[model samples]
Target: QAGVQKVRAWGPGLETGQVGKSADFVVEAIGTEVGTLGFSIEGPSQAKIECDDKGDGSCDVRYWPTEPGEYAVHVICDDEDIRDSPFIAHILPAPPDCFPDKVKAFGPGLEPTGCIVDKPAEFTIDARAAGKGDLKLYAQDADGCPIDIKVIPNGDGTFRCSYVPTKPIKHTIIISWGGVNVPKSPFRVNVGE
Candidate 1:
């Protein structure tokens, strides 16, 4: 009682089942059939292929490619090819890593942006790194006087680095992640009238 059924599986690699970070595909069967798999891969290389089969109408296939490229997965069931056996498998690219690589700042902690004075000047901030590491943030005045600051992690990957400018001259904000400073870090801002 099966023409075509749905299937699922996971493979290619184990460490990168992150879904978004890795690439994969799904296959299905109608019912009462045995099947074969074919892969037409291009560019660098493709991830591995995995499958789960049901006696009747379903086969689940999954995988995560180590490299990036366009791929097609073909299926032959019950001694014949299914409707569209060769399904497209587009492996997504990896995200920017954290490291010795560059770290990025977002929200209001970046350059060309500054708080007015109070909110004495409060702004949301976020940090991203291509490499892996922890971070620390602090601030000071132009003359190198420590300014009172408050930071609240937004529970996401963002934060709120706030301060009230007691001395309205120039302020310096520093972000040290992975025990090192990111390129162009230690942002400077002016507190004008």
Candidate 2:
């Protein structure tokens, strides 16, 4: 009820053009009180991207929402126990951002990984200040198309925002503090099938 009921781990099959093809690792939650289970891509930072009914016990690897980087794809059964071997996924970066340091503590940065085509995809940016004054957030696409930007002050030296990406293309998020423009991070989203 409060612990992992059961766990199953698997690796993605190798195939051509599958450079970005994600594998599926299934996990079965049996006789557990936990109503929902979550899956996260683990590495330097943790990103929770998938979750399903306890009955399914299965999560698709293709749902990994980040570009190529060293990651330990893990399935958490009931948010408790972990499956063995740590499913490994390597993704390649799509459109690279030149300035990253300008947006310090802005993001893990946008990942060039998974997206939903023609559908609304959402992402959150975490902006924390080192010294403090005020923080601002901005976004734009590869074609220099600007995405609507919003800024929410945390009142504690931090700012954040969530964006709904409606297109499947390269994008960028910019954060600035105290009227000074910060660096930018590259992110990609897929919309529409």
Candidate 3:
């Protein structure tokens, strides 16, 4: 404590980051001398660290994460922790090539009305241009209970999805590719007589 310097550290890199992307933060020595600052990243894998002194009492810190997971960043000044050392950072995986915006879905089932009880409501999803990813579809009743839905792959980047409602009510339909919802997803369908 006697030899350590009072410091402050914060930034988006300390809270959350993306894999293979640069994350950064700032470390400033408060009311004290600025000397050589040390940074240590402990996580799933090794990350590249770069620190640049702005010629003042603060240094800009940048790091590139090699994997997606949790990481603890240790900021040391004179072999002691700064004001807030060992900050936790969460790293997310790289974005997939398939985007929800490029996927298209349509047909009678997706319409807001005319869903008949006990009748299979069908729809078509065309994802030929959406790249490669897992296509998923599901439905839920008004009570938030899961309902059975059928998916038939057309072998040409298209799918035939259908669901039969047991009662006349509102149903929630969700369509996702990869791990994200497609455009206009969670479509609401009203089942009636």
Give the TM-score comparing model 2 with the true structure, all chains together: 0.35
Predicted structure with the largest TM-score when compared to the true one: 3
**CA lDDT for candidate 3:** 0.74
Error of 1 at 30 (Å): 80
Better of 1 and 3 by TM-score: 3
Model 1: per-residue Cα lDDT over 23-139, one tens digit each: 322333323343554444333454455565533333334455566555555555544545654455544455445452255554453343455555356655455433454556656
**Candidate 2 residue spans exceeding 4 A from truth:** 1-103, 106-109, 117-129, 181-193
Model 1 TM-score (2 dp) = 0.41
Off by over 4 Å in 3: 1-92
Candidate 3, residue 173: Cα displacement in angstroms equals: 0.6
Question: Which candidate, 2 or 3, would have the higher TM-score against the true structure?
Answer: 3
Q: Give all candidates' CA lDDT scores.
A: 0.48, 0.41, 0.74
Instruction: Indicate the worst ten consecutive residues by lDDT in candidate 2.
Output: 11-20
- Pick the lDDT winner: 3
